[PDB]
Design a protein around this ligand. Structure first.
Ligand SMILES: Nc1ncnc2c1ncn2[C@@H]1O[C@H](COP(=O)(O)OP(=O)(O)OP(=O)(O)O)[C@@H](O)[C@H]1O
Lengths: 594, 55
DNA sequence: ATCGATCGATC
DNA sequence: GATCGATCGATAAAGTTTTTTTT
């Protein structure tokens, strides 16, 4: 390599000013790895070259990285490895790149392919839904002759070097080298690496409807494994690459494609459209916005700026979405620290409107729509052979609902399969099944949001208020709040309605989502010896006034009456259970029961 | 009651149990009482978990 | 990649 | 004509959730 190395050589003296600002960063991350591990009684090798600093004073060295990125990456590795030992070697893994920056119109949505930038750089976004296995793989073993006591050294290349077209080495353990020594190999002195195949869908909103969502796939490496949950808005960028032999294999390969498009990539980025950083300024404003004695009322009407009223409902959603704690019993069954509300209403009264705008501020809570299929909380042994001979229990919809919220529609308009499905997973936090394989108790902290319609028209006043839809009352007993939405005619109400549907054809949301996702990580009081005294007076009267009124209650309803006020103090962001929380919890039930 | 791992070696040759136990406390105390002898003694618990199967 | 069968060359 | 050696060709893979009428 003489002439193919001089521009590689010229880069080695060039970009040392580009990491004038990173030559500290490359060594400072590993001196504490030489100090955490030496004093136990941890980070990968990630070197974020900004594209700006390379673009700012180089053109020919820059232009090749977006035209022919197949001769130019093991240059930048080769300078980088010798600037690690020459920095630090005295205390007694090639430091590959990450390559973040901007790109200038390479946001190819994989519904579209390339015709010109094949084998180039490409930025790709979307959602992943495949999440296949994890499995190690060698790169190099170290043979050893026991007789004469001397080692050997051999590398085995694969489709993981990403750029060079190496002659493959399909050998597993080449034994008996040119000697008479029965060979050994110190596998602890060997080295290994892993693979993970994941397919990415299309974000199904900016793809115009003339096709179903397509998909491609990406092979990544050790640094970013177990990072992507199924259901994350991910952003990845790597090289484009074809492999395999096709079309001109030995015989009879007619009308068979032979170029598997792959991506060998880096820098998997989550996005939000957990990463929400905040300075001292905005964290102090929410302390200043924790100060007033009205913030539970201001946050209620600042949520859905299209619909009038229902402030009992509008407080309930924000009370539910932030959620309450579950103190797990030591050597005992934890109770239902989740909360599960329900709605029902005579039709076209926005009972389904507010169920889907919670999904925009979901904070990684992707819900379904409730289609009559088994798979709501199971797998039913879908394996697809897991690349020829492995069986996996691929999770349907409970790997996503953990510490999140879901919502489903048309409860009464289902078959019998979901009725036994929501039976177990409500009284029990988990599910366990051996469909065709093994029992496995995988856990899930989830909470439903319901919606249903009464069958017999406008009959919610002339008949029994209970037994009203006759879906099994085990679920009615396992839920608490059954709001009956009224739509009676008031001549000032509909007059006010008539203008608010006209002024919608043209204190804020991102501050709201930051508030709850900061208040999910602070303290939990649970304790005031007199706030617990007022609520039992506030229950035993209606425990004697349950059959003399419309609805009978149960003993588990007492666990609601702590749980609502428990999260109501989380709105206050205080380590004390106050007294004022035992007044909102009273009258909210008093509207749900009278 | 001398070399106790050799004492367990006697209770196997007469064929009543086929499991010896070469633990680490009989290696570190073997190195604790080799701390005072100022000679080059390489680390043992390293190599038996740097590459365990050659032991 | 390994094993078996067939063909060719040499003794 | 028979035996031995070398070269070329052939041989190994796996299943069990949606949907129809029907009782
Ligand atoms: N009570 C209401 N106040 C204000 N707007 C309303 C109300 N009810 C309906 N709307 C308007 O109706 C539109 C959509 O209503 P929506 O489709 O959610 O009814 P729905 O809840 O689906 O009824 P159902 O679930 O019975 O079909 C919204 O744009 C909303 O502005």
């Amino acid at each position: 390599p003489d002439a193919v190395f001089g521009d590689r050589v010229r880069r080695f003296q060039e970009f040392l000013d580009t990491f004038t600002s990173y030559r500290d960063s490359v060594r400072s991350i590993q001196v504490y790895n030489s100090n955490n591990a030496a004093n136990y009684n941890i980070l990968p090798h990630r070197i974020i070259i900004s594209l700006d600093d390379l673009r700012e004073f180089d053109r020919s060295f820059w232009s090749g990285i977006l035209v022919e990125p197949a001769y130019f990456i093991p240059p930048a590795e080769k300078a980088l490895t010798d600037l690690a030992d020459s920095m630090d070697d005295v205390p007694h893994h090639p430091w590959k790149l990450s390559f973040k920056g901007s790109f200038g119109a390479h946001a190819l949505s994989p519904r579209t392919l390339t015709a010109q930038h094949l084998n180039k750089l490409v930025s790709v976004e979307g959602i992943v839904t495949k999440t296949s296995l994890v499995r190690p793989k060698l790169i190099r073993s170290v043979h050893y002759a026991a007789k004469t006591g001397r080692f050997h050294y051999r590398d085995y290349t694969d489709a993981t070097t990403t750029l060079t077209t190496r002659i493959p080495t399909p050998a597993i353990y080449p034994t008996e080298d040119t000697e008479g020594n029965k060979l050994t190999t110190e596998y602890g002195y060997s080295t290994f690496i892993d693979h993970q195949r994941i397919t990415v869908q299309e974000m199904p909103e900016m793809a115009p409807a003339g096709q179903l969502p397509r998909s491609i796939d990406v092979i990544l490496d050790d640094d970013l494994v177990d990072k992507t949950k199924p259901g994350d808005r991910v952003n990845v960028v790597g090289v484009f690459k074809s492999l395999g032999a096709g079309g001109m294999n030995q015989s009879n390969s007619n009308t068979l494609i032979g170029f598997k498009t792959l991506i060998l990539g880096n820098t998997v980025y989550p996005l939000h459209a957990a990463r929400q950083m905040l300075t001292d300024f905005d964290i102090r404003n929410i302390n200043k916005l924790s100060k007033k004695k009205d913030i539970f009322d201001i946050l209620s009407q600042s949520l859905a700026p299209s619909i009038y009223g229902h402030d009992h409902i509008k407080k309930a959603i924000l009370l539910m979405l932030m959620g309450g704690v579950e103190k797990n019993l030591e050597n005992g069954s934890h109770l239902r620290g989740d909360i599960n509300i329900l709605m029902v209403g005579d039709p076209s009264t926005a009972k389904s409107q507010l169920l889907r705008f919670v999904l925009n501020t979901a904070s990684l809570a992707i819900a379904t729509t409730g289609r009559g299929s088994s798979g709501v909380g199971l797998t039913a042994a879908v394996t697809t052979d897991r690349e020829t001979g492995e069986r996996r229990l691929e999770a349907g919809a409970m790997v996503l609902a953990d510490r999140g919220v879901v919502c489903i529609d048309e409860f009464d308009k289902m078959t019998d399969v979901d009725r036994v499905a929501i039976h177990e997973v409500m009284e029990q936090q988990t599910v366990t099944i051996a469909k065709a394989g093994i029992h496995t108790t995988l856990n899930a902290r989830c909470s439903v949001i319901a919606a249903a319609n009464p069958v017999f028209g406008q009959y919610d006043v002339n008949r029994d208020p209970h037994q009203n839809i006759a879906l099994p009352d085990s679920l009615l007993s396992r839920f608490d709040l059954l709001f009956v939405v009224t739509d009676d005619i008031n001549e000032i109400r509909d007059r006010s309605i008539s203008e608010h549907v006209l002024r919608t054809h043209r204190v804020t949301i991102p501050f709201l989502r930051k508030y709850v996702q900061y208040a999910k990580e602070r303290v939990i009081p649970q304790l005031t010896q007199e706030a617990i005294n007022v609520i039992v007076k506030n229950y035993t009267d209606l425990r004697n006034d349950d059959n003399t009124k419309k609805s009978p209650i149960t003993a588990r309803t007492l666990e609601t009456l702590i749980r609502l006020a428990t999260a109501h103090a989380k709105v206050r962001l205080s380590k004390t259970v106050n007294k004022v929380d035992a007044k909102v919890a009273a009258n909210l039930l008093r509207f749900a029961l009278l | 009651k001398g070399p106790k791992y050799m004492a367990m070696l006697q209770k196997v040759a007469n064929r009543e149990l086929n499991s010896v136990i070469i633990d680490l406390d009989d290696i570190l105390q073997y190195q604790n009482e080799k701390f005072l002898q100022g000679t080059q003694a390489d680390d043992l618990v390293s190599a038996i978990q740097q590459n365990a199967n050659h032991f």
